[PDB]
Amino acid sequence: INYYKDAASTSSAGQSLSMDPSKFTEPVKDLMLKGAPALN
Amino acid sequence: INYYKDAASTSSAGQSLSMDPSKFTEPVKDLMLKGAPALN
Amino acid sequence: GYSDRVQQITLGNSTITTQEAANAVVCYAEWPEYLPDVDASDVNKTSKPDTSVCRFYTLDSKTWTTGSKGWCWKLPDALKDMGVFGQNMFFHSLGRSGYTVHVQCNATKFHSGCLLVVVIPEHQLASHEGGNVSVKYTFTHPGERGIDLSSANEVGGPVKDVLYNMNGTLLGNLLIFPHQFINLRTNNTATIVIPYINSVPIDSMTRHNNVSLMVIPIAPLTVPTGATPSLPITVTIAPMCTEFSGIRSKSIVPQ
Amino acid sequence: GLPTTTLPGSGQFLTTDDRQSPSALPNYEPTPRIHIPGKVHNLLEIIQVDTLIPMNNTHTKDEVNSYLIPLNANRQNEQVFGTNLFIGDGVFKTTLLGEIVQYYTHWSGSLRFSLMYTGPALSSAKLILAYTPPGARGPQDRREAMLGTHVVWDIGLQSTIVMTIPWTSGVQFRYTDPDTYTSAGFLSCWYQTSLILPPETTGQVYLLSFISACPDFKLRLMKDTQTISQTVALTE
Amino acid sequence: GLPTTTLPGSGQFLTTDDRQSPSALPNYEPTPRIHIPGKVHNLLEIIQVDTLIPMNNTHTKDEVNSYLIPLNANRQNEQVFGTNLFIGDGVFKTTLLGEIVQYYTHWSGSLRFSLMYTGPALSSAKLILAYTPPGARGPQDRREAMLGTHVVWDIGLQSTIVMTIPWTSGVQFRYTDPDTYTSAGFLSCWYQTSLILPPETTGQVYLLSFISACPDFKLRLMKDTQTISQTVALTE
Amino acid sequence: GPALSSAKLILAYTPPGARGPQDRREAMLGTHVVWDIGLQSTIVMTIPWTSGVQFRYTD
Amino acid sequence: TVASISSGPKHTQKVPILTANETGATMPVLPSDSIETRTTYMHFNGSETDVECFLGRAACVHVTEIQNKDATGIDNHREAKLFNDWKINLSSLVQLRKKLELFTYVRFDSEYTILATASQPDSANYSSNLVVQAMYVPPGAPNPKEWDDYTWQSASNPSVFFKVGDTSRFSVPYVGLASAYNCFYDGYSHDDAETQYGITVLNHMGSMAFRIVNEHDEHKTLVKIRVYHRAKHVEAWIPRAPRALPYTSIGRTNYPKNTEPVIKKRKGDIKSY
Ligand SMILES: COc1ccc(N2CCN(c3cccc(C)c3)CC2)nn1
């Protein structure tokens, strides 16, 4: 129950439960498959 | 939920969301169309 | 017979071929794109010179020697004088751009050495004076020359200490930024595609640089016996999806 | 008895909170409303009405004359007036727009700047108004001025010209109190050809100038105005 | 009036509680969000990116050189480097992994340790990396080392080798601050055959080493880092 | 050159109207190809037809 | 969810553990690519590492102090701590600062909590009960000058009145000019040759003013204000390397000269355990 009118006044947000490290761990242009050779 | 009986005791009103500047910006008797000459 | 290894990038009226690549990085897995209306604020129609600004400019070459500490360029600064890209830059109030960065360094199968090529969004430098000394404008706008981390402290300039990234963080952790290594034994180029990254939809190109490109020797250069002890490093950079807006009189900037 | 726990902030008085209160006058019946023309709902409604700018600020005590921008016959190439666009300060500051902007911290939007000509009907003139977006200096000559937002105004039967300063900005809000990073440009005006008076006529002619906000406009984060203060409470 | 009772804890301020509060700025409209590449949602997303380990810690002032593990040509049977696995201390401590682990009290999971070789292309080498699970001493010779988790690495075209320290543990969580009961083992590396340089070449070659966490990893019970402190408030 | 050597050259085409470039900076602003010497021995640069008039004289 | 699958002996032409780090990727290698594993489940979600959780607890961001005393003959209230402002910022104290600067741009609502306690360091008959007023003087508003200016009427400016010993609490929406707060800024406010460098030129959110509403009693009373800040509704972009050296200034990245080696030197060899 929100007792207040504005959105800033609500409690903390709830877990992204998004999670996708590939923008950070695999930003390569041509896809790399694990197990296939790195450099062909 | 109002806890009180009288109307003065309720919280602030809620946004007019009315908004019509023409009583102030265009109080002319004969309508002016933008693009048409001001004085004919 | 496609290898990760050979590549061709054609952009505008200029083409680059590498026969010894190590894939390419696209920052944060996003490719440069123009500014959508839903994200727009300034009401001005923007100018998109296209092929006259989105081509490859090769900056002047550096020389890696056994004593090198590393070099640093800022964008869009490094290009402030390249062809029509630069003119547009000084003439509009606002502009926006992504880039393809291609760093080149070839040697032979007897050399060793490994450079880190990294792009740091919003690289705010530190004053070597400490306290709250600022880093004057000119010092953070070296132009095509870039900053040479093995040059001496100057007054009003930034600190040039490599184990600290010019800001109080350790060299070792720069790997959290989009980056690629050039290991003479593997690699001969590094290519990074940079999407436009800012907290505003379009900004000024002269009062704010939005990425520093940094090339840092990490495993020292080691040449074969009686080889000349140095290799040149060349940086070629191409603006991509550039847009300029708010045209007028032509900025005058310090120094 | 239902168990409760009180949180941090209990008992505080926040002048901006909005809650219910007991009425001191239980059951009282207010006077009926009758109809009155003129109801205002938003301050955004009123900042679109234009008001005069004391552009000619060069006097030494407030006078009707600082509303008049003078024009000289037969000058060529020269500059009529110049001002920066810090709407919360300087010429703008006493105008209704300036005066309301000062109740808020941030503004964004387009401005409408118009000039009404008052010279004899048998005279003629062509002026150029130029808006210079942030990043360059106030223009120093028309050549410089004409390369940015501009309108050649031809003085005619239609007495006023409405120039718009379109919102040109990286950051989507600017500060109303003058700030650099957040600065908006300059506005200048020059003779395009020149004012020409008919025979039997002489002297200076004046332009009146107005400012109002486009429907584009946004103002946010209310605060207190530097435009009013006091040293002791007033009495009757 | 509804009857209530207040419980123990009323009026306390717990920095970790999450409740509603009145907004000081009623009705204010925040700037629109635009798109920015790079959004982070979990610290677990970032500790999977590998960063360099200053393994060569033997210097006396921080230098680029403590990231370089040297290799000697023609040595046989010998040991390249050794370290315990207290990820919250020692070599690991300044790495991004080490640096984040320090914001939490407990960790569990597999680690990924990789070595990238930088020697001339015409050289060759075979190294063995060994993980020694808790309970035995740091191995003293390869024979001892090779009886635990190990990978023979053959230096080739493929420049890096990724060793995983699989989670070997009785207790399902370990402390990030070094603790005995909770200790994780040792990591050592030895020549399997030996580094061989081509003609016309000489000296030391170096390995770079990285550390990142497997998708396996768990961190819990947040706390304050020993990695930052201060004696007076900073000012502008 | 020997197979164990390496090199990177830039070839530049300068369309009519400017002088023969005097340094690479000047050269690199017109049609150009960075050539990386590798296994693939030849590089093919095209001088695309850049012209106002649709024919030129051979003399 | 499985944390590890079961995997047995391997003798392949498909080697997942050989990679090329020069590419910039961190290949997702697992225990089961190089040893024989058994199935195990995660039993865990990664809840407490969510950025909302990481930045979502109250941190002390500021400690100031004001006193209640006779202002008679004081020529400079501000200077007597009759009242005190706080050019608002979060860079002041280092604990929360290192946490935020793990990101480049951050966006979130703030929920401030203000604790005020009183001290009576010299002989008093009693402890008085003082009410503090905290008024947010955004940029472009009149700035107090005296501890009972017309300013403090604060007819348009949000202000909270609470008692010393108590706590005040109220949150404010994200009041950034841009789409997000910059944690770093490699720019200037304009192309000036001598204008400051860095964030400072963006941090312009005004200042918070504190004062006691009470007139003076016979003794003097020291009131010390602690402001706590909790981020709610957090959004963070572009991770960066953590801060290694100590901080010297609000808003610049500068570190102190002749600082000490931040990497612990081995007591022994590279070979040491
Ligand atoms: C560097 O990042 C940030 C992040 C948040 C922040 N602000 C400071 C001002 N603050 C604020 C805003 C409104 C009212 C009051 C009392 C305080 C909101 C958070 N400042 N810098």
Side-chain angles (χ1 to χ4, degrees), chain C residues 5 30 39 109-112 132 163-164 170-173 175-176 183 185 198-200 218 220 224-225, chain E residues 35-37 50 52 62-64 67-68 94 96 117-122 156-157 199-201 206 236:
Chain C
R5 291 271 214 33
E30 277 193 40
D39 275 2
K109 328 185 109 54
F110 304 78
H111 291 70
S112 355
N132 64 322
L163 248 269
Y164 304 136
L170 271 181
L171 167 73
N173 292 340
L175 266 51
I176 186 71
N183 181 197
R185 57 141 30 235
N198 201 177
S199 49
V200 301
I218 297 223
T225 266
Chain E
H35 167 74
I36 296 173
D50 43 34
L52 293 184
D62 311 309
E63 302 177 339
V64 171
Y67 284 123
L68 314 162
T94 16
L96 180 55
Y117 174 89
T118 80
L122 292 159
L157 205 195
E200 295 317 324
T201 259
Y206 302 109
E236 223 159 84

Short mmCIF file of all heavy atoms in Angstrom, two decimals, chain C residues 5 30 39 109-112 132 163-164 170-173 175-176 183 185 198-200 218 220 224-225, chain E residues 35-37 50 52 62-64 67-68 94 96 117-122 156-157 199-201 206 236:
data_model
loop_
_atom_site.label_atom_id
_atom_site.label_comp_id
_atom_site.label_asym_id
_atom_site.label_seq_id
_atom_site.Cartn_x
_atom_site.Cartn_y
_atom_site.Cartn_z
N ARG C 5 40.88 -13.32 -37.99
CA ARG C 5 42.16 -12.88 -38.36
C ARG C 5 42.28 -11.88 -39.47
O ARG C 5 43.02 -10.84 -39.29
CB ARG C 5 42.99 -14.20 -38.70
CG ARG C 5 43.20 -14.96 -37.34
CD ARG C 5 44.54 -14.30 -36.88
NE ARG C 5 45.38 -15.28 -36.15
CZ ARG C 5 45.28 -16.62 -36.57
NH1 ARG C 5 44.62 -16.91 -37.71
NH2 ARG C 5 45.69 -17.61 -35.68
N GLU C 30 27.01 -2.71 -28.11
CA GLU C 30 26.17 -1.83 -28.86
C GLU C 30 26.88 -1.11 -29.97
O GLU C 30 27.94 -0.51 -29.78
CB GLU C 30 25.64 -0.70 -27.95
CG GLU C 30 24.44 -1.11 -27.18
CD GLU C 30 23.64 -0.08 -26.48
OE1 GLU C 30 23.36 1.04 -26.94
OE2 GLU C 30 23.27 -0.53 -25.34
N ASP C 39 14.33 10.21 -27.71
CA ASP C 39 15.41 10.66 -26.85
C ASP C 39 15.86 12.11 -27.04
O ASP C 39 16.64 12.58 -26.19
CB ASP C 39 16.61 9.79 -27.00
CG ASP C 39 16.50 8.58 -26.13
OD1 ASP C 39 15.45 8.47 -25.46
OD2 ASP C 39 17.49 7.79 -26.14
N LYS C 109 58.19 -12.60 -35.94
CA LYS C 109 57.98 -13.71 -34.95
C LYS C 109 59.13 -13.83 -33.98
O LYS C 109 59.17 -14.89 -33.27
CB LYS C 109 57.63 -15.04 -35.55
CG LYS C 109 56.87 -15.04 -36.80
CD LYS C 109 56.44 -16.32 -37.34
CE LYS C 109 54.95 -16.64 -37.28
NZ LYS C 109 54.21 -15.52 -37.91
N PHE C 110 60.05 -12.88 -33.93
CA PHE C 110 61.15 -12.96 -32.94
C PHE C 110 60.91 -11.88 -31.87
O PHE C 110 61.52 -11.99 -30.77
CB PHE C 110 62.50 -12.89 -33.52
CG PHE C 110 62.87 -13.89 -34.56
CD1 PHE C 110 62.43 -13.75 -35.86
CD2 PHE C 110 63.73 -14.94 -34.24
CE1 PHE C 110 62.75 -14.62 -36.85
CE2 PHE C 110 64.07 -15.85 -35.25
CZ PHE C 110 63.55 -15.69 -36.57
N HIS C 111 60.06 -10.89 -32.20
CA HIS C 111 59.77 -9.84 -31.16
C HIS C 111 58.80 -10.35 -30.12
O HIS C 111 58.15 -11.39 -30.39
CB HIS C 111 59.17 -8.62 -31.82
CG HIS C 111 60.12 -7.86 -32.68
ND1 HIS C 111 60.60 -8.32 -33.88
CD2 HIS C 111 60.63 -6.62 -32.54
CE1 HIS C 111 61.39 -7.41 -34.42
NE2 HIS C 111 61.41 -6.35 -33.60
N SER C 112 58.68 -9.72 -28.99
CA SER C 112 57.75 -9.97 -27.89
C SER C 112 57.33 -8.54 -27.42
O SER C 112 58.12 -7.64 -27.68
CB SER C 112 58.26 -10.54 -26.63
OG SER C 112 59.64 -10.88 -26.73
N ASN C 132 43.07 19.88 -4.46
CA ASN C 132 41.92 20.08 -5.40
C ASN C 132 42.41 20.97 -6.52
O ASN C 132 41.64 21.81 -6.97
CB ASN C 132 40.71 20.69 -4.64
CG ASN C 132 41.21 22.07 -4.18
OD1 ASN C 132 42.43 22.14 -3.78
ND2 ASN C 132 40.47 23.11 -4.29
N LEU C 163 50.68 3.11 -13.28
CA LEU C 163 49.97 2.09 -12.41
C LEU C 163 48.68 2.75 -11.91
O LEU C 163 47.79 2.02 -11.37
CB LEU C 163 50.89 1.39 -11.43
CG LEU C 163 51.37 -0.02 -11.32
CD1 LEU C 163 50.49 -0.95 -10.44
CD2 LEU C 163 51.36 -0.88 -12.52
N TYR C 164 48.39 4.01 -12.07
CA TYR C 164 47.13 4.57 -11.56
C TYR C 164 46.16 5.12 -12.57
O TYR C 164 45.25 5.92 -12.09
CB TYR C 164 47.42 5.67 -10.53
CG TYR C 164 48.29 5.14 -9.42
CD1 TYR C 164 49.37 5.87 -8.92
CD2 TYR C 164 48.02 3.90 -8.88
CE1 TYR C 164 50.15 5.34 -7.90
CE2 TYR C 164 48.78 3.35 -7.87
CZ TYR C 164 49.84 4.08 -7.41
OH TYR C 164 50.61 3.53 -6.39
N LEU C 170 43.76 1.25 -10.28
CA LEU C 170 44.96 0.46 -10.70
C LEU C 170 44.93 -0.01 -12.13
O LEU C 170 43.93 -0.50 -12.65
CB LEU C 170 45.02 -0.62 -9.62
CG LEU C 170 45.76 -0.42 -8.36
CD1 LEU C 170 45.66 -1.67 -7.48
CD2 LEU C 170 47.22 -0.17 -8.65
N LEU C 171 46.05 0.04 -12.85
CA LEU C 171 46.21 -0.39 -14.23
C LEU C 171 45.57 -1.76 -14.42
O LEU C 171 44.80 -1.98 -15.36
CB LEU C 171 47.69 -0.37 -14.64
CG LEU C 171 48.11 -1.06 -15.94
CD1 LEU C 171 47.66 -0.28 -17.12
CD2 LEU C 171 49.63 -1.21 -16.02
N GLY C 172 45.85 -2.69 -13.59
CA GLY C 172 45.27 -4.01 -13.63
C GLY C 172 43.80 -4.07 -13.83
O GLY C 172 43.40 -5.07 -14.48
N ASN C 173 42.97 -3.14 -13.42
CA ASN C 173 41.51 -3.21 -13.53
C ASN C 173 40.94 -2.47 -14.68
O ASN C 173 39.74 -2.24 -14.67
CB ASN C 173 40.86 -2.64 -12.26
CG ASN C 173 41.19 -3.63 -11.17
OD1 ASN C 173 41.52 -4.79 -11.41
ND2 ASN C 173 41.15 -3.15 -9.98
N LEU C 175 40.72 -3.53 -17.39
CA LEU C 175 40.14 -4.60 -18.19
C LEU C 175 38.63 -4.59 -18.01
O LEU C 175 37.91 -5.24 -18.82
CB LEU C 175 40.86 -5.92 -17.84
CG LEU C 175 42.00 -6.26 -18.75
CD1 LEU C 175 42.95 -5.09 -18.88
CD2 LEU C 175 42.74 -7.47 -18.34
N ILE C 176 38.09 -3.90 -16.96
CA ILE C 176 36.61 -3.81 -16.93
C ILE C 176 36.12 -2.90 -18.08
O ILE C 176 34.88 -2.96 -18.42
CB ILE C 176 36.11 -3.47 -15.54
CG1 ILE C 176 34.54 -3.54 -15.55
CG2 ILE C 176 36.48 -2.06 -15.07
CD1 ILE C 176 34.11 -5.01 -15.67
N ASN C 183 49.29 -8.45 -28.92
CA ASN C 183 50.47 -9.28 -28.38
C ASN C 183 51.23 -9.68 -29.67
O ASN C 183 50.72 -10.48 -30.48
CB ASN C 183 49.95 -10.30 -27.51
CG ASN C 183 50.68 -11.30 -26.75
OD1 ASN C 183 50.06 -12.37 -26.25
ND2 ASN C 183 51.96 -11.23 -26.49
N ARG C 185 53.10 -11.61 -30.68
CA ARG C 185 53.05 -13.02 -31.06
C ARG C 185 51.72 -13.44 -31.62
O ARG C 185 51.78 -14.56 -32.16
CB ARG C 185 53.32 -13.98 -29.85
CG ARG C 185 52.38 -13.81 -28.70
CD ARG C 185 51.96 -15.04 -28.04
NE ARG C 185 53.00 -16.04 -28.14
CZ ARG C 185 52.83 -17.25 -28.64
NH1 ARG C 185 51.61 -17.65 -29.09
NH2 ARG C 185 53.86 -18.08 -28.80
N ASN C 198 26.69 8.92 -23.19
CA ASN C 198 26.58 10.20 -22.44
C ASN C 198 25.32 10.18 -21.61
O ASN C 198 24.44 9.32 -21.78
CB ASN C 198 26.67 11.31 -23.46
CG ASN C 198 27.08 12.62 -22.85
OD1 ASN C 198 27.27 13.65 -23.53
ND2 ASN C 198 27.20 12.56 -21.55
N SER C 199 25.14 11.11 -20.68
CA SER C 199 23.99 11.24 -19.81
C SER C 199 23.03 12.30 -20.40
O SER C 199 22.04 12.55 -19.73
CB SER C 199 24.35 11.67 -18.42
OG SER C 199 25.22 12.81 -18.42
N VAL C 200 23.40 12.87 -21.51
CA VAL C 200 22.55 13.78 -22.28
C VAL C 200 22.52 13.31 -23.72
O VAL C 200 23.54 12.70 -24.19
CB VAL C 200 23.08 15.22 -22.16
CG1 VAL C 200 23.11 15.62 -20.74
CG2 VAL C 200 24.39 15.29 -22.93
N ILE C 218 52.44 -3.17 -21.73
CA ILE C 218 52.36 -3.92 -20.46
C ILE C 218 53.49 -4.95 -20.44
O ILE C 218 54.24 -5.03 -19.41
CB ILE C 218 50.96 -4.59 -20.26
CG1 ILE C 218 49.93 -3.46 -20.19
CG2 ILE C 218 50.89 -5.57 -19.07
CD1 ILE C 218 48.86 -3.55 -19.13
N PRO C 220 56.84 -5.37 -21.85
CA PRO C 220 57.84 -4.54 -22.52
C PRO C 220 58.21 -5.07 -23.88
O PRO C 220 58.20 -6.29 -24.09
CB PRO C 220 59.04 -4.70 -21.65
CG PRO C 220 58.83 -6.09 -21.04
CD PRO C 220 57.37 -5.93 -20.55
N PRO C 224 64.50 -8.75 -31.33
CA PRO C 224 65.53 -9.79 -31.61
C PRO C 224 66.88 -9.09 -31.54
O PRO C 224 66.98 -7.89 -31.58
CB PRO C 224 65.22 -10.34 -32.94
CG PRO C 224 64.34 -9.34 -33.59
CD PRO C 224 63.79 -8.40 -32.55
N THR C 225 67.90 -9.88 -31.39
CA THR C 225 69.26 -9.48 -31.23
C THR C 225 69.77 -8.63 -32.38
O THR C 225 69.71 -8.93 -33.61
CB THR C 225 70.25 -10.71 -31.04
OG1 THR C 225 70.33 -10.80 -29.59
CG2 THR C 225 71.55 -10.45 -31.73
N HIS E 35 18.62 6.50 -23.52
CA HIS E 35 19.27 5.15 -23.46
C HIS E 35 20.74 5.27 -23.22
O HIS E 35 21.27 6.14 -23.92
CB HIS E 35 19.12 4.47 -24.80
CG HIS E 35 19.96 3.27 -24.96
ND1 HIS E 35 19.69 2.09 -24.34
CD2 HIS E 35 21.06 3.08 -25.77
CE1 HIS E 35 20.63 1.21 -24.71
NE2 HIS E 35 21.45 1.78 -25.58
N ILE E 36 21.38 4.52 -22.44
CA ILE E 36 22.90 4.71 -22.29
C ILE E 36 23.40 3.29 -22.39
O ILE E 36 22.75 2.49 -21.63
CB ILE E 36 23.09 5.30 -20.84
CG1 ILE E 36 22.42 6.71 -20.67
CG2 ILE E 36 24.52 5.32 -20.36
CD1 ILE E 36 22.49 7.14 -19.15
N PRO E 37 24.34 2.90 -23.19
CA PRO E 37 24.84 1.51 -23.21
C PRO E 37 25.44 1.20 -21.85
O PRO E 37 25.67 2.18 -21.05
CB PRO E 37 25.79 1.49 -24.30
CG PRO E 37 25.92 2.83 -24.83
CD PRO E 37 24.63 3.54 -24.46
N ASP E 50 37.31 -10.72 -16.57
CA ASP E 50 38.62 -10.98 -15.89
C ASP E 50 39.45 -9.70 -15.93
O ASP E 50 39.30 -8.89 -16.82
CB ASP E 50 39.24 -12.17 -16.26
CG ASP E 50 39.52 -12.94 -17.42
OD1 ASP E 50 39.76 -12.54 -18.55
OD2 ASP E 50 39.62 -14.26 -17.24
N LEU E 52 43.62 -8.41 -14.51
CA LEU E 52 45.00 -8.80 -14.27
C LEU E 52 45.30 -8.89 -12.77
O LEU E 52 44.78 -8.03 -11.98
CB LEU E 52 45.87 -7.70 -14.92
CG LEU E 52 45.92 -7.51 -16.39
CD1 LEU E 52 46.87 -6.47 -16.90
CD2 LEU E 52 46.31 -8.85 -17.04
N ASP E 62 54.53 0.29 -6.12
CA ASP E 62 53.66 -0.33 -7.13
C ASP E 62 54.26 -0.07 -8.53
O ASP E 62 54.53 1.10 -8.78
CB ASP E 62 52.25 0.21 -7.13
CG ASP E 62 51.50 0.30 -5.87
OD1 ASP E 62 51.43 -0.72 -5.11
OD2 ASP E 62 50.93 1.33 -5.60
N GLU E 63 54.39 -1.08 -9.32
CA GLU E 63 54.93 -0.93 -10.69
C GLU E 63 54.30 -1.87 -11.67
O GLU E 63 53.86 -2.95 -11.31
CB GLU E 63 56.40 -1.15 -10.66
CG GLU E 63 57.13 -0.14 -9.65
CD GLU E 63 58.60 -0.61 -9.73
OE1 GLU E 63 58.55 -1.87 -10.19
OE2 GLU E 63 59.57 0.08 -9.49
N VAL E 64 54.32 -1.51 -12.97
CA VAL E 64 53.67 -2.27 -14.04
C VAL E 64 54.26 -3.66 -14.09
O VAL E 64 53.78 -4.54 -14.82
CB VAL E 64 53.80 -1.58 -15.40
CG1 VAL E 64 53.34 -2.40 -16.54
CG2 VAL E 64 53.04 -0.28 -15.37
N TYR E 67 52.78 -7.10 -12.56
CA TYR E 67 51.74 -7.79 -13.31
C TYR E 67 52.45 -8.85 -14.17
O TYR E 67 51.70 -9.70 -14.65
CB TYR E 67 50.96 -6.86 -14.19
CG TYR E 67 50.00 -6.06 -13.42
CD1 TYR E 67 50.02 -4.67 -13.46
CD2 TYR E 67 49.04 -6.69 -12.60
CE1 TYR E 67 49.12 -3.91 -12.71
CE2 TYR E 67 48.11 -5.93 -11.85
CZ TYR E 67 48.16 -4.55 -11.93
OH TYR E 67 47.30 -3.73 -11.23
N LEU E 68 53.76 -8.75 -14.32
CA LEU E 68 54.50 -9.66 -15.20
C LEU E 68 55.13 -10.81 -14.44
O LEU E 68 55.95 -10.51 -13.55
CB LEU E 68 55.52 -8.85 -15.99
CG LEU E 68 55.09 -7.57 -16.62
CD1 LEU E 68 56.30 -6.69 -16.99
CD2 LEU E 68 54.37 -7.79 -17.97
N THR E 94 43.57 -6.41 -4.89
CA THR E 94 43.40 -5.16 -5.64
C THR E 94 42.70 -5.41 -6.96
O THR E 94 42.40 -4.39 -7.54
CB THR E 94 44.73 -4.43 -6.04
OG1 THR E 94 45.80 -5.48 -5.87
CG2 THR E 94 45.05 -3.31 -5.13
N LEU E 96 39.66 -6.56 -9.44
CA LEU E 96 38.22 -6.24 -9.34
C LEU E 96 37.48 -7.28 -8.53
O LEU E 96 36.54 -6.97 -7.79
CB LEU E 96 37.69 -6.12 -10.79
CG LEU E 96 36.19 -5.80 -10.90
CD1 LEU E 96 35.93 -4.53 -10.10
CD2 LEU E 96 35.87 -5.62 -12.33
N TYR E 117 50.25 -16.03 -22.65
CA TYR E 117 51.71 -16.02 -22.91
C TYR E 117 52.09 -14.91 -23.87
O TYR E 117 51.41 -14.65 -24.89
CB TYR E 117 52.11 -17.41 -23.35
CG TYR E 117 53.53 -17.56 -23.81
CD1 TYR E 117 54.51 -17.88 -22.90
CD2 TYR E 117 53.90 -17.38 -25.14
CE1 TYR E 117 55.83 -18.01 -23.27
CE2 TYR E 117 55.24 -17.52 -25.52
CZ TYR E 117 56.20 -17.82 -24.56
OH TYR E 117 57.51 -17.95 -24.90
N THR E 118 53.20 -14.20 -23.62
CA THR E 118 53.62 -13.08 -24.45
C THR E 118 54.97 -13.25 -25.13
O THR E 118 55.42 -12.30 -25.89
CB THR E 118 53.50 -11.71 -23.71
OG1 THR E 118 54.80 -11.78 -22.89
CG2 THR E 118 52.32 -11.45 -22.86
N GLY E 119 55.63 -14.40 -25.00
CA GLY E 119 56.95 -14.65 -25.65
C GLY E 119 56.92 -14.64 -27.15
O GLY E 119 55.82 -14.79 -27.78
N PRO E 120 58.10 -14.51 -27.78
CA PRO E 120 58.13 -14.52 -29.28
C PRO E 120 57.30 -15.71 -29.77
O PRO E 120 57.19 -16.77 -29.13
CB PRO E 120 59.58 -14.59 -29.66
CG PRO E 120 60.25 -15.18 -28.50
CD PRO E 120 59.35 -15.04 -27.27
N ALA E 121 56.68 -15.48 -30.94
CA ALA E 121 55.96 -16.52 -31.62
C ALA E 121 56.80 -17.76 -31.94
O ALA E 121 56.10 -18.78 -32.04
CB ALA E 121 55.54 -16.11 -33.06
N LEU E 122 58.07 -17.71 -32.24
CA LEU E 122 58.91 -18.86 -32.59
C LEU E 122 59.48 -19.59 -31.37
O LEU E 122 60.34 -20.45 -31.54
CB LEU E 122 59.93 -18.47 -33.63
CG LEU E 122 59.43 -18.12 -35.02
CD1 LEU E 122 60.46 -17.28 -35.77
CD2 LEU E 122 59.27 -19.40 -35.75
N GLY E 156 50.86 -22.26 -27.56
CA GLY E 156 50.71 -22.37 -29.01
C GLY E 156 50.12 -21.10 -29.57
O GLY E 156 50.29 -20.05 -29.06
N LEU E 157 49.45 -21.36 -30.68
CA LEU E 157 48.76 -20.32 -31.43
C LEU E 157 47.74 -19.66 -30.55
O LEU E 157 47.68 -18.46 -30.46
CB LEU E 157 48.26 -21.00 -32.67
CG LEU E 157 48.06 -20.12 -33.84
CD1 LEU E 157 47.22 -20.78 -34.89
CD2 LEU E 157 47.28 -18.78 -33.33
N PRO E 199 66.53 -18.84 -32.04
CA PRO E 199 67.77 -18.15 -32.27
C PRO E 199 67.57 -16.64 -32.34
O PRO E 199 66.47 -16.14 -32.69
CB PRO E 199 68.20 -18.62 -33.67
CG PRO E 199 67.51 -19.91 -33.90
CD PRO E 199 66.44 -20.07 -32.86
N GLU E 200 68.64 -15.91 -32.08
CA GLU E 200 68.62 -14.45 -32.25
C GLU E 200 67.73 -13.82 -31.22
O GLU E 200 67.38 -12.63 -31.30
CB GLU E 200 68.09 -14.14 -33.66
CG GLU E 200 68.96 -14.61 -34.85
CD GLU E 200 70.43 -14.35 -34.65
OE1 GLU E 200 70.67 -13.24 -34.02
OE2 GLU E 200 71.34 -15.08 -34.95
N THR E 201 67.35 -14.58 -30.24
CA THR E 201 66.42 -14.07 -29.21
C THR E 201 66.95 -14.25 -27.86
O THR E 201 67.68 -15.29 -27.55
CB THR E 201 65.11 -14.98 -29.37
OG1 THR E 201 64.22 -14.14 -30.08
CG2 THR E 201 64.54 -15.54 -28.10
N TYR E 206 57.40 -13.00 -20.47
CA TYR E 206 56.48 -12.96 -19.33
C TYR E 206 55.12 -13.50 -19.63
O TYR E 206 54.68 -13.36 -20.77
CB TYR E 206 56.20 -11.45 -19.04
CG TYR E 206 57.49 -10.73 -18.76
CD1 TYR E 206 58.01 -9.83 -19.66
CD2 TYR E 206 58.18 -11.01 -17.59
CE1 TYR E 206 59.21 -9.20 -19.40
CE2 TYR E 206 59.38 -10.37 -17.31
CZ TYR E 206 59.88 -9.48 -18.23
OH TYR E 206 61.06 -8.84 -17.91
N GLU E 236 35.42 20.89 -1.11
CA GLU E 236 35.59 21.19 -2.57
C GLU E 236 36.87 21.98 -2.73
O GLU E 236 37.31 22.13 -3.89
CB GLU E 236 34.44 21.95 -3.09
CG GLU E 236 33.82 21.59 -4.45
CD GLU E 236 32.36 22.13 -4.54
OE1 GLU E 236 32.31 23.35 -4.90
OE2 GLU E 236 31.37 21.37 -4.22
#
